[PDB]
From a paper:
Angiotensin I-converting enzyme (ACE, EC 3.4.15.1) is a membrane-bound, zinc- and chloride-dependent peptidyl dipeptidase that catalyzes the conversion of the inactive decapeptide angiotensin I (Ang I) to the vasoconstrictor octapeptide angiotensin II (Ang II) by removing a carboxy-terminal dipeptide. It consists of two homologous catalytically active zinc binding centers on each N- and C-domain, referred to as nACE and cACE, respectively, with significant differences in their physiological functions. As previously shown, the overall structure of cACE is ellipsoidal, composed of two lobes, referred to as subdomains 1 and 2. At the core of the molecule is the active site composed of the HEXXH motif residues, His383, His387, and Glu411, that coordinate the catalytic zinc ion.
Numbering used by the authors: 40 to 344, 350 to 434, 438 to 617
The structure:
């Protein structure tokens, strides 16, 4: 009966708001102010939210969605039918929540120590080393140490985690946890669509890889780089080799072009974490999008004073939104600040929907918003207007190369993480083979090799945040494809003509309008609709990303040919 379904979702909304807000508060308070007491308040709230999820989920499952007419109420009820972990029996729920905590804590407190010397944390110490050291042995110390200390220590938890996340999935009508995660896209063709998108980016990635490999051969020596092989995984300027832009200085196409180091300029001109978020906020409002409320500035944690990994927080009351980031003053982190502020923008845009529909059109959309703005921020024009820099085709290629080292290098990495996890969850990778299958994919997709042979008890996936924190990853792959589609469309709405990479949407109210109407849908409609509102068509497409990078593909092709490069590796 329609009226009874309608009433049921009104009640679910009122009560979810209250319970989720209380849970979010306790999760914040442990993420920022670890305390035995904040971790104890967190443990209580886990029990509260489970009980509410079990209560309304059991009620939701009594309705026959097949016979409901109103499509909103049908959709909401369908979501509430999925209890997630609250479907578990009590013992197993307890054990699962404790495993998640233990894994997340283990990762966040791990350190890598010199004997009779200092102990280094991932952020900022080890990331700095991976970004700035140009010495094979120093990079290897950090790369291997982080795996020895974080990765190996997550292993004891992972099999039971898999058992329990899968058990919950099956109790909610899925075959395993990857199935449940894939379901968030509501796209039966998802695996093949993504495969196709990846395949389209292979020429650009293989040409970037070959060019970077040649430059590493020049710096690290012929004895350490095989011009026909995979690249050692510790040399790309980043702990996971997921973005390569910190080795720009080793691969600059045209050295004779001046670029100012923005880090020096940011530091010397008195930039702070606070100032970095004010610039992000100011860009959103330039587009006519919403400012973050006064409360955001009061309650956010914008520096290390904790779980440091950058994250945006909805407190499910339509007024309180926060970022938690251990911000360092540099351009890499200004982009991370923009990313996080696009999550906040989304929260604010869909804040008046029912709480069950307060998500992105799909998870990739949530990830893409901030990155779209950052694309304009990162342009040489934009950096100059911020006083962080002082024409030529040589400048163009240099800029494209910088952008490519992040955006194109990330494509195979972002694709492979959940390829691994889907096969763990479906049972085709058992714990005996976790690590070998990870490295098979690191070779197949990224063309990387481990600098030190892996050994019994290694668990390199565990050294990447998203694995112990149980955060799906395919969202980031989708993000990097679709953010270029949004840029293309917003630039076209902004009246930009000429090379897409020269576009800066700063101050375009027209661009901000396309984004706002789509964000306002939250999760109320199939995501193709939001895709079409923004772009004029309903598909995920690598066309826009290829269009952005076309000058670089052509440059890289001619350069690799000149040196007789053999693209790929065995
Ligand atoms: C199908 O139902 C939605 C939801 O209606 C709201 O939620 C119900 C549970 C109940 O509380 C209703 O009184 C609410 O209206 C309808 O959506 C809304 O429509 C109103 C005006 O028509 C609009 O102002 C709201 O923003 C809409 N909210 C949404 C989309 O969540 C919807 O119109 C119903 N379908 C039709 C057209 O009959
Ligand atoms: C903040 C708020 O009150 N929003 C509600 C929402 O109600 C209305 C809202 O009054 C108007 C204007 O703000 O916009 C259309 C509706 O969304 O109702 C939601 C339940 O459907 C509730 O979650 C939300 O907090
Ligand atoms: O008991 C339950 O069913 C749930 C409990 N929790 C407790 C709060 C940890 C959840 C937490 C979720 N997230 C926390 C915010 N970031 C990631 C997602 C979630 F999506 C679902 C659930 C439940 O279903
Ligand atoms: O921010 C948070 O803490 C939560 C966020 N989410 C939403 C997903 C982002 C949740 C979703 C839950 N669901 C239960 C199962 N069916 C609907 C989804 C949940 F129980 C708890 C939470 C949170 O605590
Ligand atoms: C891309 C992803 N970003 C984020 O988690 O905020 C990562 O950092 O691996
Ligand atoms: Cl690794
Ligand atoms: Cl996802
Ligand atoms: Zn994000």
């Amino acid at each position: 009966d329609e009226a009874e379904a309608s009433k049921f979702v009104e009640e679910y909304d009122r009560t979810s708001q209250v319970v989720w807000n209380e849970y979010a508060g306790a999760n914040w308070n442990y993420n920022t102010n670890i305390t035995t007491e904040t971790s104890k308040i967190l443990l209580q709230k886990n029990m509260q939210i489970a009980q509410h999820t079990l209560k309304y989920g059991t009620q939701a499952r009594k309705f026959d969605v097949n016979q409901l007419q109103n499509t909103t109420i049908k959709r909401i009820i369908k979501k509430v039918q999925d209890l997630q972990r609250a479907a578990l029996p009590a013992q197993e729920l307890e054990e699962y929540n404790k495993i998640l905590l233990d894994m997340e804590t283990t990762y966040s407190v791990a350190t890598v120590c010199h004997p009779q010397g200092s102990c280094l944390q991932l952020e900022p110490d080890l990331t700095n080393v991976m970004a700035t050291s140009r010495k094979y042995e120093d990079l290897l110390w950090a790369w291997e140490g982080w795996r020895d200390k974080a990765g190996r220590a997550i292993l004891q938890f992972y099999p039971k985690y898999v058992e329990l996340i899968n058990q919950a999935a099956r109790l909610n009508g899925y075959v395993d946890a990857g199935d449940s995660w894939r379901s968030m896209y509501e796209t039966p063709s998802l695996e093949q669509d993504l495969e196709r998108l990846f395949q389209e980016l292979q020429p650009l990635y293989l040409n970037l890889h070959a060019y970077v490999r040649r430059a590493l051969h020049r710096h690290y020596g012929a004895q350490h780089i095989n011009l026909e092989g995979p690249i050692p995984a510790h040399l790309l300027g980043n702990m996971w080799a997921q973005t390569w832009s910190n080795i720009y200085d080793l691969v600059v196409p045209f050295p004779s072009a001046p670029s100012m180091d923005t880090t020096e300029a940011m530091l010397k001109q008195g930039w702070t974490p606070r100032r970095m978020f004010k610039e992000a906020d100011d860009f959103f409002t330039s587009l006519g999008l919403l400012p973050v409320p006064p409360e955001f500035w009061q309650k956010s944690m914008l520096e290390k004073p904790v779980v440091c990994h950058a994250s945006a927080w909805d407190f499910y009351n339509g007024k309180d939104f926060r970022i938690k980031q251990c911000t360092t003053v540099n351009l890499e982190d200004l982009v991370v600040a923009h990313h996080e502020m696009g999550h906040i923008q989304y929260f604010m845009q869909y804040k008046d929907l029912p709480v069950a529909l307060r998500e992105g059109a799909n998870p990739g959309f949530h990830e893409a918003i901030g990155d779209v703005l950052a694309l304009s921020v990162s342009t040489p024009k934009h950096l100059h207007s911020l006083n962080l820099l002082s024409g030529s085709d040589e400048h163009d290629i240099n800029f494209l190369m910088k952008m490519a080292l992040d955006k194109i290098a990330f494509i195979p990495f972002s694709y492979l993480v959940d390829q691994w996890r889907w096969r763990v969850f479906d049972g085709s990778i058992t714990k005996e083979n976790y690590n070998q299958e990870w490295w098979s994919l690191r070779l197949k997709y990224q063309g990387l090799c481990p600098p030190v042979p892996r050994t019994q008890g290694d668990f390199d996936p565990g050294a990447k945040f998203h694995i112990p924190s149980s955060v799906p990853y395919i969202r980031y792959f989708v993000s990097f494809i679709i953010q270029f589609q949004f840029h293309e469309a917003l630039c076209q709405a902004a009246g930009h003509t000429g090379p897409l990479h020269k576009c800066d949407i700063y101050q375009s109210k027209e661009a901000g309008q396309r984004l706002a109407t789509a964000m306002k849908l939250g999760f109320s409609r199939p995501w193709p609709e939001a895709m079409q509102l923004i772009t004029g068509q309903p598909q995920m497409s690598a066309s826009a990303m290829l269009s952005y990078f076309k000058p670089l593909l052509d440059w890289l092709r001619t350069e690799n040919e000149l040196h007789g490069e053999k693209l790929g590796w065995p």
